[PDB]
């Protein structure tokens, strides 16, 4: 299990040490990262990630890439992260229909940053191989009673009003143009 | 309102039908306009059986030179079939008391006008009369629930 | 047969012995080991001038074997072999004062002694067993019983032999032995004595007539076995039913009645039964007859074993088929309540045989109903009777046991039975439907060395331990508060006198609002027991014996487990009170009027509630301001008068904005906010308008439009071929929530108001499933339908009228269910719009096609349908087969615990405790705040807080936790939790458990896929195994502050 530092299909195992919880007497969360090949203009400089931990967000992605850069004295500036639908609540685009699960894309500012972080993560895999305790610790941004009561918190009337207003407005516009074109 | 149960100087009632008033009906029947009636016998949940009524008159188009404004039988036939359609939908859906709650704000009267206005104008449009002819069995429990 | 012929040879070998006196026979059977099983009261030397004798008796066969209609009984049958006495041994003054009875007793004593000697000669004694018994448990008639144990070794036949000694045809005068006649001088009639002696006088002739009718008809034997097996499943037999025993009618009486029906039957004496009928024809005819033709109170039947049968309009207040050819009442072993309950069973079987839509054979013939008394009967109380001694009765029993008492109830068994029977029956009246009494401990057999049976347990010297009283109650007349008496005049009438006497201190005189002056007696209901229980307690300990002990701790614990709302006088508030529901309805109807008088760009078409509180099924009864209740905000489908999903949903929300604006404007007493609703898939704009009413109540409003289902079907059509089933599932959920929900709540309300106890039974069932954590997967409507199944389909039983009976019937049905092969289709309708056979065939073909495309329920386990849903899927989808099998195993282990450990409060607590086993992981959590008081179940809230975010603060998040966690790991993990903390959270209502199982496929290692959808840890460079510790750590991260403990596999 120690010499398993990468996969034959080109992907890479990423360990992560998990801390001591009182209810348990340390695992190392495995992730896989592979550079992307997509012809979409906004799908450039992407690291396809597989098996993100719970609530892997841009903050912890910046934290991880900063860990890698601080270690390997490298520069890897993250740009954005895509397709983080960790619960599967947008699997079907019903809207335009009637008009990559557990994986994601990690966009960087440039191929420079992406190749640099790619080297850093190759050497992270080699850390898994040789020195298992030089591997980072993944801290989940901990959801508490506060964010769950946030989920329970009712919506804001001003947000409701403004969103409905602009949505109905642009929809009336597009519909007017559609009717013009149809009966023109 | 029919009396079904009693309890010492306090006797309760339930639904037993609905009528219009004779004076109101006479005024509605104006000359030079088509009258239209339709009716259906239909069941509810709490299996009362009833026959409900419906009447409507062709109205003049607000700009119309010709006074008579009479539909076309083909018009009439279609209107009754839709009214008949809408009434059977309301009666089956309503348990019995719910139809009661349905009639009072006259939603029926409007869905009619709505599905209708694509055939021919029409004015008034009311349920007009509903009668009961086969009620199920007492069930003292159900009657108590309606009373508060 | 060979053995019986050897027995006849043995008897013809048996010698005869002459006239002897009591002292002579006393010395005889004192120096012989056999003790004469004398019939009480024994003969006495001072009142015995006649003498004794035995000669060769008259051998014959009789019974189902003679009728050749016996079957292969698993437990074992017996063949009756009659041996009547010599008419020369008989004198014309022997049918008075136990003379012929002592004759029979000494006859049989010598008979068994010397057949025992012939047994000691023939050497069958090493495997043959000889003993005494009573002819169908009649103490006035002792009989001999021959059995065997493991060349006449007949034990593998499981049979037995009955040696009876009746009397010859017409020895004593049948009109001097008519039930009206007295023959025990001390004047009251001796009906039981009359019956015993005259039946013993004319046994065989009835067998002659039975065989004659069997030769005159064709399907007679088949009808015989049909009736026998029907009765046997019903728990009925021919034994004496006067002794706290359900019986008096078995195969013999059934056959005699069938022959008499072939001999007539109508009131016009005409032939209702025709000899050309078939088996089913004859059986349906006889059941229809016993269901339509009273035989006890207002009419009775008449026939002649030698003339056509005729029904007459005189009921002798006792089941009376009167043979004139012998001057005998056939059913003389039958109690009146026994006849009543049998007639009710007859009507039930008639209606079953008249069911044209569903088959009923399996329920009619292939289900034993007499296995669990608390299923067979709604109410049942245990009463220890320490009555003591024959002389100690004068100080133990309130009533008297004198000369006429014993002449009427020859047996104190009959006396006590009928006494408590009548006192409970009167003191209860219309509060019940049917009564039975069971003398717990009673027996029938005893060795030959005895004079009768002997018992010394339970503070008695008679055959019983205690008394269990069973009742089929009337629910509509159960929880009636006051026991109403007769009217009041100055000259106190006989009825009012007897009433006031019977009721002693409880009696009084109350006046009513209408202006009536009648006696009565009042009670005060209790939320832990029924007023029927209070009444039986009082009357039993008053008019029977001050030493009786009474209880039903079982029903006590049932009502205790029932949730008790934090409401004033809830302690005295019974189960059948729906005042809380009515108050919620009234507040809602006020709000209804407000919105209907509102004005909008549309006219409000309809406002239909679909709340579980509305349909009388919520786990708890609502409490004002108790908003921490999961079932606080009831759903209210709002629908307005008559093209894209997002614009449509946002228009819905805009209408809610307008409503909320006008409501805050001109109904400031109410509070309002908007909640994001995400229970429906792939719709990210649905907003429910939550409304708060100073009646402390909360609703959520959602605009329904037809364009919803329109656009949904459009999307169904436009979706890709592989994408289709997902949107199918989403549309199914939508339909379940928006249309079938309304239809269901309507019809369920109606049928519940017709079946009162349905609401408490389904509430208890929901409680039980919450304790078992299955509620996270089960949708309410599903459980509601399952628990309504017994009422709407009671076969073979009766409609439950007690929370215990209903709960147990629900569990019995679920346990015996086989959802893989068996469907469920309910006729939601009041008692006697049912499904046409056409709709039935449609639902069945639906079920068959579904089980074809799914023969093992990987996609759908339980299938239940009705008029509201011809699909049978709307409340059953989205349930994993592990959950299904866990539910069925729960039901089965519960039924087995009931089968084994006996029904007690301990077994009930074992039912309610959760198994918590087989769980790959179990996380034990506790919430920081207490919530039992806030949830409003009794251990109180009194307003709404000033912040709605703080409403949410007091709310409960563990539901959100488990739901979203299942949404994430739904590819790999199956979870369960507790929904109702206010009942399943300990003493504060604050403890929950997250119990989870691993998907057995992802249990192992697999190919590393781009869409494998799990937290894995490879075992090699290509194959990936699941990451258990990572999973547990992620659960801990998600529930950091509320996870208190974790326990792994």
Calpha distance C981→C583 (Å, rounded): 24
Mutant choice from B9, B141, B142 vs C, greatest count of C C-beta within 10 A: B141
Residue in B7, B114, B136 nearest the CB of C830? B136
Tell me the CA distances in angstroms from C596 to A162, B110, B124, C47, C947, one per residue in order: 28, 15, 21, 93, 28
Query: Residue C859 has which token pair?
Result: 């996609």
The sign of the dihedral angle between the CA atoms of C730, C731, C733, C734 is positive
Interruption sites in chain A after residues (C→N beyond 2.5 Å): 25, 99
Calpha distance C317→C335 (Å, rounded): 10
Residue in A24, A53, A95 nearest the CB of C644? A95
Pairing mode of beta strands B2-6, C864-865: unpaired
For B46, nearest residue in chain C (alpha carbons): C750
Q: Is C276 exposed, middle or buried (0-12, 13-18, 19+ CB in 10 A)?
A: exposed
Asked if C880 and C777 touch (Cβ cutoff 8 Å), the reply is yes
C653: which chain A residues are within 8 Å (Cβ-Cβ)?
160, 164
Place of tokens 């509810």: B44
Asked if A68 and A87 touch (Cβ cutoff 8 Å), the reply is no
Mutant choice from B49, B142, B144 vs C, greatest count of C C-beta within 10 A: B142
Asked if C988 and C1008 touch (Cβ cutoff 8 Å), the reply is no
Calpha distance C501→C495 (Å, rounded): 10
**CA R_g for chain C:** 35
C653 and A143 in contact by Cβ < 8 A?
Answer: no
Calpha distance C181→C160 (Å, rounded): 36
Helix H or strand E encompassing C1005: strand C1005-1007
Q: Which residues have a Cβ under 8 Å from the Cβ of C717 and sit 6 or more positions away?
A: none
Asked if C65 and C78 touch (Cβ cutoff 8 Å), the reply is no
A91 and C949 in contact by Cβ < 8 A?
Answer: no
Partners of C83 in the β-ladder: C59
Place of tokens 């009162």: C756
Query: Residue A69 has which token pair?
Result: 């850069």
For C834, nearest residue in chain B (alpha carbons): B47
Tell me the CA distances in angstroms from C862 to A59, C343, C815, C857, one per residue in order: 46, 36, 13, 8
What's phi and psi for C624, nearest 5 deg? -55, 140
Asked if C574 and C525 touch (Cβ cutoff 8 Å), the reply is yes
| CA angle C491–C496–C500, rounded 5-degree value | 115
* For helices C706-718 and C724-738, angle between their N-to-C axes, nearest 10 degrees: 170
Residues 884-943 of C with CB under 8 A from A: 923, 928
Asked if A155 and C676 touch (Cβ cutoff 8 Å), the reply is yes
Calpha distance C782→C862 (Å, rounded): 9
Calpha distance A127→A134 (Å, rounded): 6
Q: Which residues have a Cβ under 8 Å from the Cβ of C718 and sit 6 or more positions away?
A: A97, A98
Asked if C700 and C635 touch (Cβ cutoff 8 Å), the reply is yes
Calpha distance C61→C71 (Å, rounded): 17
Inspect the structure and tell me whether chains A and B have 3 or more CB pairs less than 8 Å apart: no
Calpha distance A102→A52 (Å, rounded): 7
Q: Is C511 exposed, middle or buried (0-12, 13-18, 19+ CB in 10 A)?
A: exposed
B115: which chain C residues are within 8 Å (Cβ-Cβ)?
642
Q: Which residues have a Cβ under 8 Å from the Cβ of C560 and sit 6 or more positions away?
A: C528
Check CB contact of B118 with chain C, cutoff 8 Å. no
The subunits that touch chain C, with at least 3 C-beta pairs less than 8 Å apart, are A, B
C641: which chain B residues are within 8 Å (Cβ-Cβ)?
107, 110-111, 114
| CA angle C823–C829–C830, rounded 5-degree value | 140
Tell me the CA distances in angstroms from C393 to C331, C399, C822, one per residue in order: 31, 9, 56
Calpha distance C241→C413 (Å, rounded): 11
Pairing mode of beta strands C973-976, C991-998: antiparallel
Resolution (A): 4.9
Asked if C342 and C236 touch (Cβ cutoff 8 Å), the reply is yes
**Cis bond leading into C796, ω under 30°?**
yes
Asked if C823 and C844 touch (Cβ cutoff 8 Å), the reply is yes
Asked if C517 and C485 touch (Cβ cutoff 8 Å), the reply is no
Query: Residue C1017 has which token pair?
Result: 């840890």
The subunits that touch chain A, with at least 3 C-beta pairs less than 8 Å apart, are C
Calpha distance C588→C580 (Å, rounded): 12
CA C545 to chain centre: 30
Using DSSP's 3-state secondary structure scheme, residue C396 falls into helix
- Domain span at residue B143? 1-148
Helices in B15-73 by DSSP H: which ranges? Answer: 22-28
Residue in B10, B45, B107 nearest the CB of C747? B45
Using DSSP's 3-state secondary structure scheme, residue C843 falls into helix
Helix H or strand E encompassing B132: strand B130-134
* Domains of chain C from N-terminus onward: 1-166+200-216 (no CATH), 167-176+217-372 (1.10.1410.10), 373-481+525-551 (3.30.70.3020), 552-916 (no CATH), 917-1049 (3.30.70.3030)
Calpha distance C803→C757 (Å, rounded): 7
DSSP string, B6-19: E-SS-EEEE--EE-
Asked if A107 and A82 touch (Cβ cutoff 8 Å), the reply is yes
**How many residues in total does chain B contain?**
148
Nearest to C787 by CA among C823, C821, C814, C818: C814
Calpha distance C936→C813 (Å, rounded): 33
In the Cβ-directed half-sphere of A58, how many Cα atoms lie within 13 Å?
A: 9
Q: Is C399 exposed, middle or buried (0-12, 13-18, 19+ CB in 10 A)?
A: middle
Residues 47-66 of B with CB under 8 A from C: 47
Nearest to C913 by CA among C974, C842, C984, C854: C984
Q: How was this structure determined?
A: cryo-EM
Asked if C201 and C166 touch (Cβ cutoff 8 Å), the reply is yes
C1040 and A97 in contact by Cβ < 8 A?
Answer: no
Asked if C571 and C939 touch (Cβ cutoff 8 Å), the reply is no
> Strand order in C517-522's β-sheet?
C482-487, C517-522, C508-511
For C967, nearest residue in chain A (alpha carbons): A87
DSSP string, C942-1001: -S--S-HHHHHHHS--HHHHHHHHHHHHTTTEEEE--S-HHHHSTTTT-EEEEEEEE-TT
What's phi and psi for C735, nearest 5 deg? -60, -45
Residue in A32, A87, A152 nearest the CB of C955? A152
Inspect the structure and tell me whether chains C and A have 3 or more CB pairs less than 8 Å apart: yes
What's phi and psi for C966, nearest 5 deg? -65, -30
The sign of the dihedral angle between the CA atoms of C239, C242, C246, C247 is positive
Calpha distance C582→C590 (Å, rounded): 12
Q: Which residues have a Cβ under 8 Å from the Cβ of C912 and sit 6 or more positions away?
A: C561, C768, C771
For residue C629, give how far its alpha carbon lies from the nearest alpha carbon of chain B (Å). Answer: 25
A148 and C968 in contact by Cβ < 8 A?
Answer: no
What's phi and psi for C655, nearest 5 deg? -60, -40
**Cis bond leading into C41, ω under 30°?**
yes
Asked if C78 and C145 touch (Cβ cutoff 8 Å), the reply is yes
Check CB contact of C747 with chain B, cutoff 8 Å. yes
Helices (H) and strands (E) in chain A, counts: 5, 4
Helices in C485-565 by DSSP H: which ranges? Answer: 494-503, 531-543, 553-561
Partners of C864 in the β-ladder: C824
SS (H, E, C) C850-903: HHHCCCCCCCCCCCEECCCCCCCCCCCCCCCHHHHHHHHHHHHHHHHHHHHHCC
C-alpha distance across the termini of chain B, in Å: 16
Q: Is C213 exposed, middle or buried (0-12, 13-18, 19+ CB in 10 A)?
A: buried
The sign of the dihedral angle between the CA atoms of B25, B26, B32, B34 is positive
For B95, nearest residue in chain C (alpha carbons): C746
Nearest to A168 by CA among C649, C670, C690: C649
Asked if C675 and C684 touch (Cβ cutoff 8 Å), the reply is no
Asked if C954 and C934 touch (Cβ cutoff 8 Å), the reply is yes
Query: Residue C269 has which token pair?
Result: 């004496």
B148 and C756 in contact by Cβ < 8 A?
Answer: no
CATH number for the domain running over A110-169: 6.10.250.2760
Place of tokens 């006396």: C415
Tell me the CA distances in angstroms from C777 to C823, C996, C1046, one per residue in order: 20, 12, 22
C645 and A148 in contact by Cβ < 8 A?
Answer: no
What's phi and psi for A71, nearest 5 deg? -70, -65
What letters, b where the CB count within 10 A reaches 16 and e where it falls short, cover C417-444? Answer: bbbbbebbbebbeebbbbbbbbbbbbeb
B111 and C830 in contact by Cβ < 8 A?
Answer: no
> Strand order in C466-473's β-sheet?
C432-440, C466-473, C379-384, C549-551
| Domains held by chain B: number | 1
Check CB contact of C717 with chain A, cutoff 8 Å. no
What letters, b where the CB count within 10 A reaches 16 and e where it falls short, cover A16-48? Answer: bebeebeebeebbbbbbbbebeeeeeeeebbbb
8-state DSSP, C501: H
């Amino acid at each position: 299990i120690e010499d398993i530092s990468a996969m034959k299909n080109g992907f890479i195992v990423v360990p992560f040490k998990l801390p001591d919880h009182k209810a348990l007497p340390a695992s190392l969360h495995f992730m896989f990262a592979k550079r992307h090949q997509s012809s979409n203009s906004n799908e450039s400089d992407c690291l396809f990630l597989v098996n993100l931990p719970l609530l892997s967000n841009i903050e912890h992605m910046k934290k991880f890439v900063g860990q890698l850069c601080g270690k390997y004295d490298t520069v890897s500036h993250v740009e954005e992260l895509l397709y983080n639908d960790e619960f599967g609540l947008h699997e079907v685009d019903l809207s335009a229909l009637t008009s990559p699960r557990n994986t994601a894309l990690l966009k960087f500012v440039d191929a420079a940053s992406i190749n640099n972080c790619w080297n850093a993560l190759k050497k992270y895999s080699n850390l898994h191989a040789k020195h298992p305790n030089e591997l980072f610790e993944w801290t989940y941004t901990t959801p508490s009673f506060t964010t769950f009561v946030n989920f329970y918190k009712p919506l804001d009337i001003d947000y409701l009003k403004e969103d409905i207003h602009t949505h109905m407005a642009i929809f009336e516009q597009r519909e007017a143009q559609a009717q013009e074109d149809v009966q023109s | 309102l029919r009396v079904d149960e009693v309890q010492g100087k306090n006797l309760l009632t339930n639904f037993h039908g609905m009528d219009f008033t004779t004076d109101k009906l006479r005024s509605m029947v104006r000359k030079w306009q088509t009258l239209i009636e339709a009716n259906v016998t239909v069941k509810t949940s709490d299996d009362y059986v009833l026959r409900i009524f419906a009447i409507a008159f062709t109205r003049k188009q607000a700009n119309q030179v010709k006074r008579h404004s009479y539909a076309q039988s083909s018009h009439i036939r279609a209107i009754r079939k839709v009214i008949s359609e809408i009434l059977t939908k309301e009666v089956q859906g309503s348990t019995l008391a719910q139809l009661t709650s349905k009639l009072i704000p006259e939603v029926i009267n409007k869905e009619i006008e709505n599905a209708t206005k694509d055939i021919f104008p029409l004015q008034n449009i009311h349920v007009r009369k509903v009668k009961l002819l086969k009620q199920p069995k007492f069930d003292v429990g159900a009657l108590m629930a309606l009373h508060g | 047969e060979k053995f019986l012929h050897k027995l006849y040879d043995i008897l013809q070998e048996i010698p005869d012995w002459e006239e002897k006196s009591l002292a002579e026979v006393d010395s005889f059977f004192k120096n012989k080991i056999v003790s004469v099983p004398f019939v009480d009261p024994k003969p006495i030397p001072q009142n015995t001038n006649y003498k004794f004798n035995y000669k060769k008796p008259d051998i014959s066969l009789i019974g189902s074997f003679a009728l050749k209609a016996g079957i292969y009984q698993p437990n074992g049958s017996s063949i009756d072999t009659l041996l009547t006495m010599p008419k020369e041994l008989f004198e014309k003054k022997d049918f008075l004062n136990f003379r012929c009875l002592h004759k029979r007793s000494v006859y049989l004593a010598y008979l068994t002694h010397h057949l025992l000697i012939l047994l000691k000669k023939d050497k069958l004694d090493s495997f043959l067993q000889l003993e005494y018994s009573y002819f169908d448990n009649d103490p006035l008639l002792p009989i001999l019983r021959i059995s065997c144990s493991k060349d006449y070794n007949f034990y593998k036949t499981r049979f037995s032999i009955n040696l009876l000694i009746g009397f010859p045809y017409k020895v004593f005068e049948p009109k001097k032995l008519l039930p009206n006649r007295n023959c025990i001088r001390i004047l009251p009639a001796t009906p039981l004595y009359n019956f015993s002696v005259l039946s013993s006088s004319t046994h065989e002739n009835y067998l002659k007539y039975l065989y004659k009718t069997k030769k005159q008809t064709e399907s007679f034997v088949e009808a015989t076995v049909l009736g026998r097996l029907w009765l046997q499943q019903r728990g009925f037999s021919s034994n004496m039913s006067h002794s706290g025993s359900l019986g008096g009618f078995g195969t013999f009486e059934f056959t005699i009645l069938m022959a008499a029906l072939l001999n007539g039957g109508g009131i016009n004496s005409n032939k209702i039964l025709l000899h050309g009928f078939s088996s089913y024809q004859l059986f349906k005819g006889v059941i229809k007859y016993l269901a339509t033709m009273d035989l006890c109170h207002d009419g009775h039947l008449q026939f002649h074993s030698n003339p056509a049968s005729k029904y007459i309009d005189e009921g002798f207040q006792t089941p009376t088929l009167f043979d004139k050819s012998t001057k005998v009442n056939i059913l003389t072993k039958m109690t009146v309540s026994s006849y009543q309950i049998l007639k009710e069973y007859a009507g039930e079987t008639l209606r079953m045989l008249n069911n044209v839509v569903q088959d009923q054979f399996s329920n009619i013939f292939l289900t034993n109903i007499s296995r669990f008394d608390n299923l067979k009967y709604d109410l049942c109380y245990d009463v220890q009777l320490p009555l003591g001694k024959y002389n100690n009765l004068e100080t133990s029993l309130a009533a008297t046991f004198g000369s006429m008492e014993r002449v009427k109830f020859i047996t104190l068994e009959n006396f006590l039975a009928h006494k408590i029977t009548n006192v409970a029956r009167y003191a209860l009246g219309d509060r019940i439907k049917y009564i039975q009494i069971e003398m717990v401990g009673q027996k029938s057999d005893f060795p030959i060395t005895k004079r009768k049976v002997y018992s010394n347990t339970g503070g008695n010297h008679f055959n019983f331990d205690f008394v269990r009283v069973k009742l089929i109650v009337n629910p509509s007349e159960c929880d009636k508060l006051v026991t109403k008496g007769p009217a009041h005049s100055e000259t106190m009438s006989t009825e009012a006198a007897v009433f006031k006497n019977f009721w002693g201190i409880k009696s009084s005189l109350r006046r009513f609002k209408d202006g009536s002056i009648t006696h009565c007696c009042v009670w005060s209901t209790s939320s832990s027991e029924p007023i029927i229980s209070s009444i039986v307690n009082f009357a039993l300990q008053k008019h029977v014996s001050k030493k009786a002990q009474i209880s039903n701790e079982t029903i006590k614990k049932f009502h205790n487990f029932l949730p008790l709302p934090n409401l004033p006088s809830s302690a005295k508030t019974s189960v059948l009170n729906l005042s809380s529901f009515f108050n919620l309805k009234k507040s809602f109807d006020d709000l209804y009027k407000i919105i209907f008088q509102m004005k909008l760009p549309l006219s409000v078409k309809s406002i239909l509630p679909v709340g579980s509180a509305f349909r009388y099924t919520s786990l708890c009864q609502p409490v004002p301001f108790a908003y921490s209740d999961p079932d606080f905000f009831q759903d209210v489908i709002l629908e307005f008068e008559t093209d894209e999903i997002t614009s449509l949903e946002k228009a819905k929300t805009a209408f809610l904005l307008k409503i909320q604006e006008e409501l805050s404007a001109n109904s400031s007493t109410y509070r309002s906010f908007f909640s994001r609703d995400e229970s429906i898939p792939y719709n990210l704009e649905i907003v429910t308008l939550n409304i708060l009413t100073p009646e402390g109540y909360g609703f959520k409003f959602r605009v329904l439009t037809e364009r919803d289902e329109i656009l949904y079907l459009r999307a169904i059509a436009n979706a890709r071929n592989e994408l289709k089933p997902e949107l199918e599932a989403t549309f199914l959920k939508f339909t379940a929530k928006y249309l079938a929900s309304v239809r269901h709540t309507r019809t369920l309300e109606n049928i519940s108001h017709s079946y009162q106890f349905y609401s408490p039974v389904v509430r208890l069932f929901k409680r039980w499933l919450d304790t078992h954590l299955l509620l996270g997967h089960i949708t309410d409507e599903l459980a509601e339908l399952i628990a309504i199944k017994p009422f709407v389909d009671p076969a073979p039983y009766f409609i439950p009228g007690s929370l215990e009976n209903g709960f147990l019937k629900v569990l019995k049905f679920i346990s015996q269910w086989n959802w893989k092969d068996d469907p469920l289709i309910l006729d939601l309708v009041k008692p006697e719009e049912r499904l046409t056979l056409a709709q039935y065939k449609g639902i069945q073909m639906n079920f068959t096609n579904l089980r074809n495309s799914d023969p093992n329920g990987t996609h759908l386990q339980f299938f239940v349908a009705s008029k509201n849903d011809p699909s049978g899927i709307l409340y059953s989808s989205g349930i994993p087969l592990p959950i299904a099998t866990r539910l069925t195993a729960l039901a089965k282990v519960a039924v087995n615990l009931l089968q084994t450990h006996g029904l007690n409060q301990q077994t009930i607590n074992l039912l309610f405790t959760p198994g918590l086993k087989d769980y790959d992981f179990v996380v034990d959590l506790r919430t920081p705040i207490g919530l039992k008081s806030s949830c409003g179940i009794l251990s109180a809230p009194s307003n709404f807080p000033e912040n709605l975010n703080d409403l949410s603060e007091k709310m409960d998040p563990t539901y959100q936790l488990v739901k979203y966690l299942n949404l994430k790991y739904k590819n790999s993990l199956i979870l369960s939790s507790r929904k109702y903390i206010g009942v399943n959270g300990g003493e504060k209502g604050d403890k929950n458990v997250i119990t989870g199982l691993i998907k057995p496929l992802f249990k192992g290692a697999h190919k590393f896929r781009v869409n494998l959808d799990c937290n894995v840890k490879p075992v090699d460079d290509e194959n990936v195994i699941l990451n258990k510790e990572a999973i547990f750590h992620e659960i801990a991260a998600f529930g950091n502050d509320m996870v208190i403990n974790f326990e792994t596999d």
